[PDB]
Design a protein around this ligand. Structure first.
Ligand code: HEM
Ligand SMILES: C=C1CC[C@H](O)C/C1=C/C=C1\CCC[C@]2(C)[C@@H]([C@H](C)CCCC(C)C)CC[C@@H]12
Ligand code: NA
Length: 393
């Protein structure tokens, strides 16, 4: 196969290039793509090994985005781009509201919203599965969880689209759209923080302003950058799991029948949807010193790109990896990152709950859902996203 540039958004225009990943896994699983260049890491075990060693494979040294100085400095304030010990301290501060017990307290409220969202979509008849269902549930939930009034949730969605849509013409007008979105969101976040410091509420903003670990509290910039990451993660990952999951269910109709007949299949179905969609396709690291990975010699300063979508088709880990099987078990997919990595998704419990509740509700109402046209992909080299997906109920 020709040596495709996996950092180029256009190579994802016709979908995830799974044949390229399949050839790499079999023939060159740790592969130097020359240009500057980068190592493509495509096997599950090697993604896990890179993930769990931040001392060698740093997130701070070159950031975590896969394309090739002001950008790095303007984003080293993101928790994603920190290494221990800096990272360890920040993650201890912001994780309090995301433990499994805290998240499980939301199921009934999340189910109440999902039932109402599905009901209104069915009443409409013909709609956009993204705007009316897949994006709307995580949007309402993250607004309520953060503490943003429901009237303001559309501001959160528009900001988030501008933050990640920097390669898609529908979501960006030029290169500074995202920076301006961030400035607006920082001002909004600071207003909310000031209010909850004075008058605490049961929301994440209050949890964050009150948090204290080892004599430390969140600084202004730390708070603002974590608010930003929560809003973008809340709005640009789960909705694409739901959209690709619905598409997979319609295109593998036997699986949809099984789920409709047996709602107890939903927890395993969530993990197969996550393995299938792999909504976050890749993240980058930088080697801090000379090292060996999979018999390949990686030099200090080298860019290393972990392809979670390829890991989630690894024939050594998953039997029949190109089959969508909602009962697949076990299912050690890497959609949330390599297990053991210090940055492993902080919201994985919330994401699983949102996806589980939504598909339970779609399956129980038993509507006949059908596509009325092709879904439109987000242009991205990072997110495996669906912008629109016309359906009829
Ligand atoms: C399908 C949904 C999601 C997927 C596939 C996903 C994926 C990921 C991945 C791959 C990482 C980096 C892991 C690593 O580098 O080792 C990550 C980190 C993170 N995610 Fe998730 N995510 C999802 C939903 C969410 C949600 C809903 C939230 C919050 C409401 C969230 C919050 C975060 C945060 C704060 C981090 C940074 C953690 C750190 O740097 O220590 N994510 N996510
Ligand atoms: C930070 C600021 C705010 C200050 C400056 O505007 C620079 C900047 C960029 C933010 C970006 C760049 C693109 C990718 C980022 C970092 C998004 C990130 C990849 C989201 C990941 C979501 C989830 C998978 C964890 C969130 C914010 C985005
Ligand atoms: Na119908």
């Amino acid at each position: 196969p020709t040596e495709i540039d996996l950092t180029d958004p256009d190579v994802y225009n016709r979908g995830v290039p799974h044949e390229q990943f399949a050839w790499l896994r079999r023939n060159e699983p740790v592969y130097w793509h020359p240009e500057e260049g980068y190592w493509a890491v495509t096997r599950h075990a090697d993604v896990v090994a890179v993930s769990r060693d931040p001392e060698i494979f740093s997130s701070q040294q070159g950031g975590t985005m896969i394309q090739d100085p002001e950008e790095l400095e303007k984003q080293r304030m993101m928790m994603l781009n920190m290494d221990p010990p800096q990272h360890t301290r920040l993650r201890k501060l912001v994780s309090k509201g995301f433990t499994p017990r805290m998240i499980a307290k939301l199921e009934d409220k999340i189910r109440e919203r999902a039932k109402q969202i599905v009901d209104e979509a069915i009443e409409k008849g013909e709609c956009d599965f993204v705007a009316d269902i897949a994006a709307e549930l995580p949007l309402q939930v993250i607004a309520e969880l953060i503490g943003v009034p429901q009237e303001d949730r559309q501001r959160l969605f528009d900001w988030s689209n501008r933050m990640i849509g920097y390669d898609d013409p529908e979501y960006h007008s030029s290169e500074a759209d995202g920076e301006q979105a961030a400035a607006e969101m920082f001002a909004y976040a600071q207003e909310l923080a000031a209010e909850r410091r004075k008058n605490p509420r049961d929301d994440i903003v209050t949890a964050l302003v009150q948090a204290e670990v080892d004599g430390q509290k969140l600084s202004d910039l730390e708070f603002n950058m974590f608010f930003l990451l929560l809003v973008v993660a809340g709005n640009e990952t789960t909705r694409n799991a739901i959209s690709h999951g619905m598409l997979a269910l319609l295109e593998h109709p036997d699986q949809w029948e099984r789920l409709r007949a047996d709602p107890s299949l939903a927890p395993t179905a969530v993990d197969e949807i996550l393995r299938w969609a792999s909504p976050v396709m890749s993240f980058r690291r930088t080697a801090t010193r000379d090292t060996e990975l999979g018999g390949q010699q990686i030099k200090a300063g080298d860019k290393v790109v972990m392809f979670y979508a390829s890991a989630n088709r690894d024939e050594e880990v998953f039997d029949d990896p190109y089959t969508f099987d909602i009962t697949r078990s076990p299912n050690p997919h890497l959609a949330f990152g390599g297990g053991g990595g210090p940055h492993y998704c902080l919201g994985a419990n919330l994401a699983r709950l949102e996806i589980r509740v939504m598909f339970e509700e779609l399956a129980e109402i038993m509507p006949d859902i059908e596509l009325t046209g092709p879904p439109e992909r987000l242009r991205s080299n990072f997110i495996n996203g669906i912008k629109h997906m016309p359906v009829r109920f």
